[PDB]
From a paper:
Here, we present InCellCryst, an advanced pipeline for producing homogeneous microcrystals directly within living insect cells. The rich source of biomolecules in the cellular environment allows the identification of native ligands by co-crystallization at quasi physiological conditions, representing a unique feature of InCellCryst.
The unmodified HEX-1 crystallizes in blocky hexagons. A predominant hexagonal, block-like morphology that is comparable to, although much larger than, the woronin bodies found in the native fungus, as well as a bipyramidal shape that was not reported to occur natively. For HEX-1 ori and HEX-1 cyto crystals diffracted at 100 K one distinct unit cell population was found, whereas two unit cell populations were identified for HEX-1 cyto v2. For data collection from intact crystal-containing cells at 100 K, we carefully transferred the cells onto a MicroMesh mounted on a light microscope stage. CrystFEL is optimized for still images in high multiplicity collected at RT at XFEL sources and thus, can be directly applied to serial synchrotron data. All HEX-1 structures show an increased flexibility between Phe145 and Ser151, the C-terminal loop region after the α-helix.
Residue numbers in the entry: 29 to 175
Amino acid sequence: ASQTVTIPCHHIRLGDILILQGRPCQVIRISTSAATGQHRYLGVDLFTKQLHEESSFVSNPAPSVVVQTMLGPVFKQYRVLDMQDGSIVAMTETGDVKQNLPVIDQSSLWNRLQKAFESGRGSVRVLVVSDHGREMAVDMKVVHGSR
């Protein structure tokens, strides 16, 4: 499974990526359970496009501290070396080459990536989710030059 970070429920908005039923999903609905009062998250699996739901995890770590959280994936940042037929050639921080990294079909990512790549290839990074062996670029960033 993907490496994860804990995210307080008050910091979750529609469109955020969460782990729902063990799967990285884009949140499309946030509601309150009538039975438990907890937040319930409905999401679309980034890889399979199936719907998944999961309710928040409530914990009590210290006196008078009551916390609702969810898990989000740890995103990796890769350099883009080339774009070819709906996939990209990417490079990890350590130089490891990924020859056929898929790009999610979401929010015009491929077109935005192609536009930025053609005007400055190596300031272009992709944010990558890695789940059960599979990797996919799910967003992009233009790296500020000073970095």
